[PDB]
Symmetry: C2
Subunit: 362 residues, 2 copies
């Protein structure tokens, strides 16, 4: 099912172990900041200390929302889907700060990575609470920044670390519905905001972007592990689809699950509803025992974010905040080797009809 | 890559049908609304059905105040196709689909309102005036020309426009249509899928051929200049917009229809000499490179003779193709199968970790 070529990221040869530009996800999630992996993805190398310092500072000074963008977010209703807010926010920024020539690629990517957390949170707070938040905050890290904008106070260190690792985990994942969309878009020589908007529009779909949101809803149905075992079996006998399990590509394991699971387990003890982790473990055991399926990244991602006090409806915009690095990376690559597979459709419609004038219809 | 019942180019790259009906019979006999109905509702409408539908779209021409507010804040220098992008996306925030049972209500709204989105932006950003979008014109083609130019157009102008919106309505799988399906394949809403198609159609390799053809045509004052100047572009390897096609072999059946309209319009246009320039270019492209003109070539002069500014050619593609797009989105939702794309990895092998202290 070959749609093209990438140097950016890979799942292993016998289906084992993820890498970004050759570096293991286990090493990245353990040892790197998100800024660092955005540098790897966007710039094609691991930054030195100096390079990281400068990059990290460049992004901190790109946290201003243009007046006409605020105007627009203030007019998106509270009831609108948070991913539609991202969609519009990106598109409108593109009207106000157009890419123009492609030599500005990197600067727009950097602007998007820096500002996406503010677009979501400014809309969230204005539309839900009538409050215009200050988005020009001094948080040194992007993980901390988001959590500061969202919760209104600087985050504890363990919270920063978890959020940071989650962003790394969601940054990039080869060809997938949304990254593909971004590449189809770039292959027509469209601007970078078009491509990212297209990808957001594609990620908005619950079969692609919203699995941890559905997994949180599911986990929260149950007070005890037993209830969850029994409730999952009822869903399986009723052939209902449980989100966060199995993957279109991997066949035994999702390398990112272990990392995110480790974090959820770490955050559980200092959480009001830390019992939800054991509910989740019970669900996992039951999906394995019954239909031999393993959890993907989205499953334990649900409890991690929840234990960070992130509202369930805001799970999906965080994927944009991370995966925008990967998208932009794939967009840069399409631009340099612009070949795309032309879609052709098999016709299964009617054969050439004789014209029927309107006076003779029914 | 997938299946469709919506349209096809004929078996050996000849001719074109929408749901079995020939483009020639559609352009000659049908209104755009009638053609939108065929694509969206999957049948040719009766008189009664077409009448109610035509009237339905006339009363879907109001822009919500919030959307106007947003259109007012897009600079005049913003690509008009980025305007359609944000307009579609924002309308989605304002009037969400909320369940696929509302599919048809939203598609009708998009088809009815896209002209107003473009023209309201355009006149505010370029002229500083807030136009009335709730005009009483009975036909969508004539509505767009009235909005754009500030007066009802002549019948010949309405007919041409109508024909052009029919010709652009749908054309199988293509970059833009495929993005609509890819988007729908994840169970995204209708506004997301359309917005993605617009973001894909924004690229000039796909959506801006007629604009590029107008720039080209315009380099030349006389036919003689056209011939020597194309010949210099050909000997320089570079390639000319509006010529050739991936699927068609001998001719693009939409070409003949649009060329006829351009030909009819030339005499009464200030600068109708541009047809003869186009005609000379076409002739040289046959003689030198055996290539035929595609829809986008004489679409250039047709729209130009309709007094459409060249930069505003591309949004017309959206006004027409939204019908095809929506058609494909409905069909994808009913048989939600799509090939999951894999890549061939051409990158580095597994690298050992380097602590930050240790780099360079």
């Amino acid at each position: 099912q070959s749609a093209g070529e990438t140097s950016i990221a890979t799942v292993g040869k016998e289906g084992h172990g993820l890498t970004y530009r050759g570096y293991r996800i286990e090493d990245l999630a353990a040892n790197a900041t998100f800024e660092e992996v955005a540098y790897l993805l966007l710039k094609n190398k691991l930054p030195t200390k100096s390079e990281l310092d400068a990059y990290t500072k460049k992004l901190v000074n790109l946290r201003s929302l243009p007046p006409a963008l605020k105007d627009t977010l203030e007019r998106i209703p509270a009831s609108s889907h948070p991913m539609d807010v991202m969609r519009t926010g990106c598109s409108m920024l593109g009207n106000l700060e157009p890419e123009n020539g492609f030599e500005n690629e990197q600067n727009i990517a950097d602007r998007l990575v820096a500002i996406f957390p503010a677009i979501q949170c400014y809309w969230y707070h204005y539309s839900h609470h009538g409050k215009r938040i200050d988005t020009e905050l001094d948080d040194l890290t992007l993980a901390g920044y988001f959590l500061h904008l969202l919760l209104g106070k600087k985050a504890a260190q363990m919270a920063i670390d978890c959020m940071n690792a989650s962003l790394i985990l969601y940054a990039e994942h080869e060809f997938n519905a949304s990254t593909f969309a971004a590449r189809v878009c770039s292959a027509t020589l469209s601007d970078i905001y078009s491509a990212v908007t297209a990808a957001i529009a594609t990620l908005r779909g619950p079969l692609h972007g919203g699995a941890n949101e559905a997994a949180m809803d599911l986990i929260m149905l149950y007070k005890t592990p037993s209830e969850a075992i029994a409730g999952i079996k009822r869903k399986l006998a009723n052939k209902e689809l449980i989100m966060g399990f199995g993957h279109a590509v991997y066949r035994e394991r999702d390398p990112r699950n272990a990392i995110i699971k480790s974090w959820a387990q770490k955050l559980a003890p200092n959480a009001a509803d830390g019992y939800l982790f054991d509910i989740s473990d019970a669900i996992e055991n039951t999906m394995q025992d019954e239909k031999k399926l393993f959890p993907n990244l989205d499953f334990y991602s649900a409890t991690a974010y929840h234990f960070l006090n992130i509202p369930t409806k805001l799970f999906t915009p965080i994927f944009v905040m991370s995966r925008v690095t990967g998208w932009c990376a794939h967009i840069f690559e399409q631009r340099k080797d612009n070949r795309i597979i032309r879609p052709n459709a098999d016709y299964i419609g009617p054969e050439e009809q004789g014209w029927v004038p309107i006076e003779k219809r029914r």
